[PDB]
Write an enzyme that holds these catalytic residues in place. Structure first.
Site, PDB file in Angstrom:
ATOM      1  N   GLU A 121      41.632  39.419  32.094  1.00 37.59           N
ATOM      2  CA  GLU A 121      40.700  38.299  31.979  1.00 37.59           C
ATOM      3  C   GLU A 121      39.530  38.737  31.091  1.00 37.59           C
ATOM      4  O   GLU A 121      38.377  38.765  31.521  1.00 37.59           O
ATOM      5  CB  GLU A 121      40.223  37.861  33.373  1.00 37.59           C
ATOM      6  CG  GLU A 121      39.321  36.618  33.373  1.00 37.59           C
ATOM      7  CD  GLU A 121      39.062  36.026  34.759  1.00 37.59           C
ATOM      8  OE1 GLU A 121      39.387  36.656  35.792  1.00 37.59           O
ATOM      9  OE2 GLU A 121      38.534  34.896  34.805  1.00 37.59           O
TER      10      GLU A 121
ATOM     11  N   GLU B  11      32.822  38.084  46.186  1.00 42.76           N
ATOM     12  CA  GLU B  11      32.870  39.457  45.706  1.00 42.76           C
ATOM     13  C   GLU B  11      32.203  40.451  46.654  1.00 42.76           C
ATOM     14  O   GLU B  11      32.706  41.563  46.871  1.00 42.76           O
ATOM     15  CB  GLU B  11      32.205  39.581  44.319  1.00 42.76           C
ATOM     16  CG  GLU B  11      31.967  41.037  43.903  1.00 42.76           C
ATOM     17  CD  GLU B  11      31.412  41.215  42.493  1.00 42.76           C
ATOM     18  OE1 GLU B  11      31.060  40.215  41.851  1.00 42.76           O
ATOM     19  OE2 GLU B  11      31.318  42.368  42.025  1.00 42.76           O
TER      20      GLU B  11
ATOM     21  N   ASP C 129      33.894  44.810  33.773  1.00 44.04           N
ATOM     22  CA  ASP C 129      34.873  45.110  34.805  1.00 44.04           C
ATOM     23  C   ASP C 129      35.686  43.827  34.980  1.00 44.04           C
ATOM     24  O   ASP C 129      35.308  42.904  35.712  1.00 44.04           O
ATOM     25  CB  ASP C 129      34.179  45.551  36.105  1.00 44.04           C
ATOM     26  CG  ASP C 129      33.245  44.499  36.670  1.00 44.04           C
ATOM     27  OD1 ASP C 129      32.502  43.829  35.913  1.00 44.04           O
ATOM     28  OD2 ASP C 129      33.249  44.364  37.900  1.00 44.04           O
TER      29      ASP C 129
END
Length: 310
Positions: free
Chosen positions: A114, A202, A56
């Site tokens: 990324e 996160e 992810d």
């Protein structure tokens, strides 16, 4: 009228030696945007048979401001685990109407992921332009801050001292409507954990504040979006369902719109992005907030871009 403009056709963001994490290109958008009501950006990630970086990963799209030669982030999302956006017919959808002044004529776009694997991610991007009678014929957009090159290039969170989020903004005298457009997502599982073993940034739920002229004015709650209800529900065995603070894997990062009071029209005010206080004890890694905040000025008379200054 609805015109569809095709822009990236199965382009790849990959990592390894004759590869790049970002792709760029020049596309032709209609020249006149005075009657544009809405511009929807659609992102299709094709990842058939586990042919892509299964993580992810943080990804975003930019439009280049021709005059300043600066890239503006118009949208970001987190790729789904293990699959692409197949469950979604037209892909991820993000409203980019705020950038219509830059989406005209020959426009160069940039898409980045990324990704750290050679198989990376492949995308197709197209835009739906809906013409009609807008409430405001003209708009101007300029960034206040942009620390969004990647998840780990955001603003460090929980460090002793931090700076770079206070600015001054001057709105044109003919501005009839103005607002801030912010996209913020965090990374990390840094200690000390919040209750429930939620590391920052996160997992830890926070409420950040934007102060206008030193008065706390808008609150940005990075809470649960309901990741388990994600339409892209074929992400197992990836950890797709738990709620992160303000984002989910395989979903667009929300755009936060805060409307400025019209008493700010014609006057320069101060802007400050204030993170809810927390200190990183440094025993479990780093924490970052990738953030972009833009000021949009609208009017029914030609308007110049707001002036942002330190």
């Amino acid at each position: 009228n609805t015109v569809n403009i095709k822009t990236f056709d199965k382009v790849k963001n990959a990592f390894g030696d004759g590869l790049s994490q970002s792709a760029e290109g020049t596309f032709t958008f209609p020249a006149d945007v005075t009657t544009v009501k809405t511009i929807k950006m659609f992102i299709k990630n094709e990842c058939p048979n586990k042919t892509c970086d299964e993580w992810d990963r943080y990804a975003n799209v930019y439009v280049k401001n021709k005059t300043t030669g600066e890239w503006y982030e118009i949208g970001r999302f987190i790729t789904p685990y293990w699959v692409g956006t197949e469950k979604l017919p037209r892909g991820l959808e993000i409203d980019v109407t705020d950038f219509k002044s830059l989406l005209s004529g020959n426009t160069e776009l940039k898409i980045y992921t990324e990704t750290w694997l050679a198989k990376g991610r492949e995308y197709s991007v197209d835009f739906d332009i809906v013409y009609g009678t807008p409430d405001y014929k003209y708009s101007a957009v300029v960034p206040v801050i942009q620390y969004n090159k990647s998840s780990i290039d955001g603003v460090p969170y929980g460090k002793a001292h931090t700076l770079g989020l206070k600015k001054n903004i001057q709105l044109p005298t003919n501005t009839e409507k103005a607002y801030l457009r912010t996209t913020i997502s965090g990374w990390g599982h840094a200690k000390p954990y919040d209750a429930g073993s939620r590391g920052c940034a996160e997992w830890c739920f926070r409420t950040h504040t934007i102060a206008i002229n030193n008065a706390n004015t808008f609150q940005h709650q990075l809470g649960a979006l309901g990741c388990s209800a994600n339409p892209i529900n074929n992400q197992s065995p990836g950890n797709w369902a738990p709620d992160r603070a303000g984002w989910c894997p395989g979903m667009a990062v929300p755009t936060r719109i805060d409307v400025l009071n019209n008493s700010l029209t014609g006057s320069t005010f101060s802007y400050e992005y204030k993170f809810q206080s927390w200190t990183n004890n440094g025993t479990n890694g780093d924490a970052f907030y990738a953030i972009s905040s833009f000021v949009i000025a609208k009017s029914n008379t030609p308007i110049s871009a707001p002036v942002v200054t330190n």
